């Protein structure tokens with residue numbers, strides 16, 4: 019409607035840019051433990067042009083991978099619409115859900131691995147005790 | 155669209171005339187009268203009223219030459235844009251006093267960005283608009299020194315200080331981070347991160363809310379964050395939010411009733427209203 | 441971190457896409473994490489990483505088909521943030537999702553009925569699951585629960601629907617379900633749901649046919665591949681469980697030498713089991729190569745199967761009487777694999793494959809042509825001929841010749857049509 023598009027002030031609030039996606043990725047993945055001192059720095063993979071360090075670290079590389087997979091879904095929809103069609107649009111809410119799934123499943127798997135390792139340690143200590151017992 | 159041709163049986167009685175958009179001379183006269191009325195608040199800039207209009211008229215002109223409805227449906231321009239321009243400058247100049255021409259053109263450029271630049275889609279059009287703003291400001295006012303147009307931030311906010319003053323980008327970023335902190339605590343538990351353009355649009359929404367204007371139209375993909383930012387800015391400026399929860403058996407008289415509820419609650423009672431609704435709330439052209 | 445990212449991207453993004461598109465998306469993501477040196481476990485399988493055996497067995501007992509697509513979709517319905525929107529031509533998904541939520545009294549409704557609101561809030565109060573069909577005519581008052589808006593005031597969560605205010609009861613889940621595969625949802629609804637696609641395609645049917653062949657013809661390849669899938673999660677959980685049994689037994693016995701015989705049998709069984717697992721680990725990539733070789737051997741048959749079935753569905757274009765379902769082709773395929781007189785005593789695997797291919801073509805044509813007009817018999821025969829030509833090796837594709845034969849005879853070359861010899865006539869010329 020030209021009358022409505024003319025009668026007020028119009029603001030183009032487009033889809034989140036790459037920098038916005040990258041900042042969301044950092045802030046929503048801050049609480050998880052992604053520090054890998056022994057991360058061998060690779061080369062290439064330009065997705066976001068303003069990497070905070072020129073050599074990326076583990077956390078920044080993973081957030082870069084998240085923004086890459088979002089861009090990959092965008093490209094997949096573009097290609098699928100080009101060849102035939104039948105495509106549903108992807109919104110930043112999908113990115114938020116992706117990050118939420120990543121965080122929750124990461125905490126779940128890390129916690130179960132710590133539980134298994136702690137059970138392993140308890141078993142080791144108990145078996146050391148029973149070895150002492152059989153020696154006695 | 156939504157318009158139906160009149161029957162020839164009835165057109166025979168009624169004469170019709172075409173009132174096109176006012177020409178450059180007519181726009182110049184009308185908005186020069188508005189400017190001359192406006193700048194009498196501060197007598198120090200009365201002599202820069204006619205050229206100020208000329209610059210706005212020229213900017214409107216090449217904004218209309220390009221940006222046709224073929225490029226984008228929302229790319230429409232009317233003297234309504236100019237009246238909002240004048241009203242915004244007047245609202246900004248209302249508290250300002252003994253203002254030199256520096257501030258006059260600073261707010262003029264700010265309003266130019268906030269009317270002819272934020273509605274754009276691609277970056278090239280945005281930079282073309284900014285270049286034209288700078289070029290027109292230099293063309294009509296070449297005695298002014300170049301400290302106002304090259305200011306890239308060029309952002310305003312009443313939040314800091316007491317009246318509408320230019321603010322610093324990072325000094326405003328920290329402030330709005332603190333306010334959004336306090337916000338997510340009160341309603342909207344889901345964390346909100348503050349990046350660059352989200353700061354831009356919250357500033358634009360605040361600017362449109364402060365003026366005695368009627369409506370904000372937000373265009374963008376779903377889930378990007380228009381509604382949450384509108385609610386957040388309404389939270390800052392103390393605007394109550396009324397959301398209409400439509401359904402399948404929703405009818406037009408319900409829209410009439412909650413419309414009149416909004417009008418009474420906004421006019422009979424002085425408390426300000428930010429009435430928010432989406433496409434799902436609209437069903438028919440009524 | 442890498443495998444977690446891959447799994448999250450799969451369960452959050454890779455919905456509504458057929459198996460080949462999900463696989464390509466996963467391959468692209470894994471290739472990027474390889475470029476980023478992000479340590480993700482190689483050749484990881486998402487079917488059992490996100491789910492151990494128990495709930496797979498429960499889903500199978502809950503009327504769910506054994507497809508990899510259906511397994512991944514059951515994963516998606518199991519772990520979700522946005523409420524799912526199930527797309528399914530058949531009724532298998534709805535039956536599965538009702539049988540899964542029978543204990544928590546899931547209810548049936550749709551958008552069209554006038555009582556949708558009533559049981560909507562009725563399920564909202566008691567935390568009752570709610571499946572609702574016919575998503576095509578979307579209902580807007582479902583918006584504030586899809587957004588999961590929570591007005592928690594006074595130490596208790598609340599929700600607003602229309603002019604009503606309602607108490608949002610925990611353990612409440614809604615599953616949107618549709619029937620028509622070809623529908624275009626608006627972006628506002630698309631953003632609020634995690635799309636789950638059950639539509640069968642060439643990719644999905646190819647996967648089912650290949651899996652069924654590997655189960656029937658070569659059960660040893662099937663057991664080796666199954667062992668490969670269990671190697672990542674299932675064997676380790678069994679190992680931990682029987683380790684816990686060992687620890688409990690040691691505690692109850694307190695390490696008596698008199699009971700050392702019973703305990704040493706358990707530890708020797710433990711050592712044998714561990715040796716078996718390590719032998720599987722040390723022979724893993726050999727097994728992968730062998731399974732890859734067998735899958736490449738049986739690949740053309742599955743492609744032929746998918747092509748034949750989608751040819752059967754396309755037969756409805758000629759005549760309204762040629763409606764065929766996936767169950768018809770599955771019955772044909774089961775008859776060819778098992779009830780085959782030609783496989784009474786054949787033992788050579790390549791010979792068995794060739795006989796299955798030939799008899800599949802024969803039986804499919806025979807069953808379809810029995811209920812098909814006589815003037816159309818040669819058409820479907822030519823279609824199966826094209827399918828074999830695409831599936832056979834050592835022959836050119838004959839794309840240009842077939843294109844001319846089909847539609848290249850309608851091309852503009854009327855200029856220079858010489859009468860030539862008296863035998864040739866104008867249309868012949």
Ligand SMILES: Nc1ncnc2c1ncn2[C@@H]1O[C@H](COP(=O)(O)OP(=O)(O)O)[C@@H](O)[C@H]1O
Nearest residue numbers: 344345346347352375376377378379380381382
């Ligand atoms: N800047 C942001 N940072 C984090 N999350 C955001 C931001 N903007 C929007 N969201 C998310 O979007 C959701 C609501 O989106 P909404 O405003 O309904 O989108 P739309 O206006 O397209 O309907 C919220 O749950 C919120 O988490």
